[PDB]
Amino acid sequence: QISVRGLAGVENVTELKKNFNRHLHFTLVKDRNVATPRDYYFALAHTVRDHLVGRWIRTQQHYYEKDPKRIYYLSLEFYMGRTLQNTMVNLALENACDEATYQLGLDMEELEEIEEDAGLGNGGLGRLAACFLDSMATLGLAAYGYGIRYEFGIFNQKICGGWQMEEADDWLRYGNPWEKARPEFTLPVHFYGRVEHTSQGAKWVDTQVVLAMPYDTPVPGYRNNVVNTMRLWSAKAPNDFNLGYIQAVLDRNLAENISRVLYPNDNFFEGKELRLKQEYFVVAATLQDIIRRFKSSNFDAFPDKVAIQLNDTHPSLAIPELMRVLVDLERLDWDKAWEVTVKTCAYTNHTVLPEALERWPVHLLETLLPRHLQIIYEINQRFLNRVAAAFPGDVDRLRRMSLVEEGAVKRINMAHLCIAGSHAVNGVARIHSEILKKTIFKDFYELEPHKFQNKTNGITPRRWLVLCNPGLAEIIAERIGEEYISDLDQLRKLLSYVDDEAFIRDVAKVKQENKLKFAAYLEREYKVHINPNSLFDVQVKRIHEYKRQLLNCLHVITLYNRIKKEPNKFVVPRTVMIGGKAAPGYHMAKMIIKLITAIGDVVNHDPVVGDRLRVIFLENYRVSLAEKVIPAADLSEQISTAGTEASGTGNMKFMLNGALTIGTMDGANVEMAEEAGEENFFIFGMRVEDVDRLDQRGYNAQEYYDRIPELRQIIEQLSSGFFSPKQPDLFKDIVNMLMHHDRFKVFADYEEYVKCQERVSALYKNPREWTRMVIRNIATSGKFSSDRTIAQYAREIWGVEPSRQRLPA
Amino acid sequence: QISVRGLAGVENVTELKKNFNRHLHFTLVKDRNVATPRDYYFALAHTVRDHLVGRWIRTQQHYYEKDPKRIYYLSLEFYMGRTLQNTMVNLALENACDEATYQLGLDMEELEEIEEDAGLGNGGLGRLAACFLDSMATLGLAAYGYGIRYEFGIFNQKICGGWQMEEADDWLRYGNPWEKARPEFTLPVHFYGRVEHTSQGAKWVDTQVVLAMPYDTPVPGYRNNVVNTMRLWSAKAPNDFNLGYIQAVLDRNLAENISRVLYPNDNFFEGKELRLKQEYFVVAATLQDIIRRFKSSNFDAFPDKVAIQLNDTHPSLAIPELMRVLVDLERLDWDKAWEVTVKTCAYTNHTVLPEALERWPVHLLETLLPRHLQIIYEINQRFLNRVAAAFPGDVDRLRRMSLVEEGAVKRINMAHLCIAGSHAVNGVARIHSEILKKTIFKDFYELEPHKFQNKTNGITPRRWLVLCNPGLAEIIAERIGEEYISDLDQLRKLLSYVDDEAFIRDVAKVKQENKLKFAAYLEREYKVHINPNSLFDVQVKRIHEYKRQLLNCLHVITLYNRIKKEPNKFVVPRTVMIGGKAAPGYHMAKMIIKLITAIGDVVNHDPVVGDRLRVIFLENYRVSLAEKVIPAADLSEQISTAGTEASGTGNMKFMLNGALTIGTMDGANVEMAEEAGEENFFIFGMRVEDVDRLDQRGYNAQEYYDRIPELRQIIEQLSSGFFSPKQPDLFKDIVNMLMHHDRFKVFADYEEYVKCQERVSALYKNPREWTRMVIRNIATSGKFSSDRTIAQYAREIWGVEPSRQRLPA
């Protein structure tokens, strides 16, 4: 059908159809008269997986023969989403499979919707891991993703009476055809026990053993015939475990609970034992695997052969575990072991929010990991000895830089451990990396300036353009060819088409097509009726006070009050769509969802409003819903308080897919505005410097309430029960926080946000100038490819050269 | 190689080799340089499974078109063992697969040893279910086995310091290639709740829901192209289950515990809630499946279309569940529902031991299954109304026949429920069926004589001759052809070869070959050295007081004491092998294992004994060890106290495989001796009548101790610590039971057992007369085919005609 989906040759189609019917019979044990659409999906998944296998085996063999330096990406989260379409895209099989399924009287798009998301992540950090695996395979790096195979991923969100309800994400119920169990590479992980000091050094004894069973998932590069591995560990009890009889067998579940469920907190630390167990489990099993592979090629060459990247502090125990193995088991002396650890490990920091920083109570580590605590104390002593020698007399610096925090309960600062034990520390956007050097890690920067880098985040243009927006990919490919899909900088060639009438028409047509398709999706799957000629105002991301969905709520109520004030005046019609999950224990995030649905209940049923303003809560926001709504979006809301969003990656997905951005100078918004030009971006609100000035004199929200009549009216409506008639006080906690305890200064940005939103409506009234500004955004989105990000990690941290050369098929 | 293993045609071998390499690459994602023997086993298993699929789909389609009467075999136990060799035997693929694997430089026998036993049973009852599925497929019955997919089967037995240790049987660790998950046929099962009485009848409300997910395993018939289904249910929590958040997800394990583990008690009732849950779970899910299939063809025709066979009382709740569905959900009146239930259900009783009878406390049923208890009370009232009308004034009969037992705690007699609710009640050997009518069910027999039948147990000659003893199968097939494998009565043709020198030579040669192979197996796998020219004296079966492994221990010690008394006299050398598992909580059974190993420790290290007497405890006795040891056996020990072994099936396996039997007139021993002639059987000990006479005057063990010097010496040796030097009192519980609390009268049979064992040694000294007696046993074993048993169930209980006609391939 469309060129970027590849060829449908007669031989390929015949062969796919034959293998589809072979899997339906032999694999699924079904004839055509009893097959459900789910059987058809599985037959196709098995058929496409077959094309991966040769390339996967040859790629792993190629890395054994060439023995390049190996990259180990350690994350507690991989937000993969669906695998079927992505595999077809990267193997150029999409048109052939479309043709093959069509000739069997099946619709491939209907079969694609049956696949469960692998929702093994919360949001940005988990999805960044997924984008990275894709870029590492596309750039031909010998890279392995290592994580946990959670039985239950991020919970399914149901809205019930406008409230979030959580259901278990039973994503493995029907089987996962993409994974291969490797029970033969099962490894022991130890917990509890105690330390004996012998003549021959320290001994970790009387431990409980949990087994780590690996599951391998193929990660195909973009048409380069490279297939890398994501290895996820599953917890299994040993068979002597507890071994009255019946209860001992049932108690095996205590050990297997380690890999049962993903902690659903985004940017919030919860010091739970089960979470520390998950962290050690993935680190212990992964480091044994790394060392085993290294010995099958003296530890001086280890850092020439191994890079370990830490996705935040979640796998920070990699540093003490590497020391423990090298000192206790391999009998290297401390200093040599430490040289090897630092040259091997690099640390990516993802937030400055202090509630997100991992600070593990010492009593937890003492009980669960007594040897690691000893090694952490030793690391701290030697580290503070270097601080004292560099800053003699600066006793306050010693307290601030300690890995050990004094107070009510002694805690380990896992970020301090990562900086001490890593040769490189990076933030995830330039403003974030500058804030790390100026504020939270200023002391560490003064000691070791050379360690601190920036690696601005990115997204894979395979999932986030070719896969989710084939219509846009195609009209681009018509003018500048297909090379941009693995070289996104080539999108700059589109700036020479900004005054081309045909290209303007095509860009606007694809947007309209995407909006019609998404409006229909809403009607079928959720019986809701939206005007597809309205501006699609989209804020999708986890529900958090710092992301200021509440600021968006204040704008929506302002538009409502303006319409009711002057019902017969023209306003640009908008559909305001807000979606995202709240962490189950985050009361305020749960109240914000309820406010969004309560506003919708008033706004969507007011006959005076008409189809001029619709407010929709998008339920169960996840990777597969992002692929549908982002190509449909006109306006991207990136409205975090300046200094709180380390980078963001949603911002980039929308820029790539033909939405204009309204945003603060926060995270990667700053670099996006710089790439496109400030004149092609709806920037508003306090900069970082303005927020600091407000903090010095003190944030008084009352001042804004007293001076802005439009704002006072909204707050009185919230308080009085305008939006909750049956429960007049329902939103008293929201009003109370906004007036007295707002860390994120929602009122301070209100006036400038509303005024900037008027400029958006004004430009939307002029379709041609809207579309020309969109072209200027798409054309400058190239920097925000994860291929650029990963090439920067490869050259400046890992010391390996990316390659775009094909392996032989 | 040998004819009964089928043809190895060039095309077949080429095709198997091609599909083996296809599965190794595509299914296992392995090249030949990294493949382990386990990968090779899996490649072959997938290759053979491929040949099942066409026949499985066609057979299920044939039953849909022809709509025959359906047989539902309900059991809590299916003791399947390994599937690979059995599948090859029944598809005639064994020689082709032997050839195919040989040409790839692999040994198929080495690959077969990598398969885990499906140990989803305890012993005889579980293995009888497995033999039956094989016969039902071979006789072309539209039959379904329904059970529980236990995550953990019967525990692996380790011997540590001569003591039994249990380990979890993690049989699914590496995957089960034989099963197909059918998550689309998932069904809800209800527990707890309460009963509302409406105007429109009773309503079971406020229940907890567990899901039953079925796994289908193919059951191939013998070369008839029929493949029946074994459907096993797995427990899954619903996704709203408990749905703070983390703990709700972890608590899903409470519901999934239902299918976690097989209760490891053989002939012992334990009234545990989890066990009652397993019983209801398999019954509820199975009856919904049966009714669904029936509606996809008015309940008058239900018994013309459905037979439900109950494997003991374990699924007795099928009777109240069928009533509950028919009355509460389908709105039939009581009397019609009851007519349908009785005509559908038949009950097989397997024991007379009172500790084996299921008597569920009312408080358990009241809480877990309140509606079933109401229906059971109603059944009891109507049943006792029929008893009172037939036996007016006999108030004692009313108390004895009640489904409800009065006492400390009220209990439901599940056997009484099964007799009341079933059109047929059978025992499992003629003597057992006579004992049911004379003693434990005498009152039920007088009310409904027509219900009571015999169906003498049998074994499948596929697993138990062709598969485990190919050498014997072949020398038989040389003289009388292959037809006997599905018509075992044809073995009578062997009586005309009892004086043929060549056949005598071949029978003795196969036995010798089997003994050499098993002696080597002992050396490799367990570093033990046995004389293969000794008599192989084998007692293998679960460890139980009624099976009198202790009587065998007394004989072994008697031989030891006789050798030590007269060291320089000739005795027929014996290897005494005893094997079996004790239930983990059965103290006495655990002490007996320890006595066996303690005797071995004295006997096997006495230089005066030499290789004249060896005592071996065979560790981890299970179906795959039975396939090795039974063909190696000379003497089969079937030495249960008369009246305790309902049938036995080990007895039959040994008769078929060329061992002579030493046994009591118990269970099927009686019919085996009748088939072969008493002169070709080593019968000893009390008959049932003699045991009754001993009970009337009272069993005084002291009398035997006082009158038999050889016995007194053994008891003094046990007491004094001859067999436990470090712990002189180790066996005081054994001596104490034998002297004062022996329910099974071990001393009463001692003299006759030892004398009969001398007759065995005497006949073994004459190889030609030993082998002629063996031929008389093999030649008369035809009755003990499960094909005969299942044809008798089919004609006299289920009302269907068996068929030996092939489906088209």
Ligand SMILES: OC[C@H]1O[C@@H](c2csc(-c3ccc4ccccc4c3)n2)[C@H](O)[C@@H](O)[C@@H]1O
């Ligand atoms: O770099 C990828 C994205 O990371 C997000 C980010 C920062 S901390 C965090 C996170 C995610 C999951 C967590 C689970 C347990 C404890 C702490 C956690 C912190 N996620 C940041 O908030 C985004 O700005 C950024 O784009």
Ligand SMILES: OC[C@H]1O[C@@H](c2csc(-c3ccc4ccccc4c3)n2)[C@H](O)[C@@H](O)[C@@H]1O
């Ligand atoms: O008919 C098959 C065989 O059944 C055996 C037999 C009788 S009761 C029983 C059994 C097995 C497992 C059980 C689990 C829980 C509660 C009671 C149970 C009873 N097994 C009998 O003991 C054997 O004689 C007979 O050959």
Ligand SMILES: *Cc1c(COP(=O)(O)O)cnc(C)c1O
């Ligand atoms: C990209 C993505 C995110 C991250 O979005 P931000 O706006 O950067 O917070 C979260 N969830 C999903 C499903 C995503 O695809």
Ligand SMILES: *Cc1c(COP(=O)(O)O)cnc(C)c1O
């Ligand atoms: C046949 C069999 C049994 C039953 O043997 P009995 O001697 O009748 O108790 C028990 N276990 C296994 C493994 C069997 O194969």
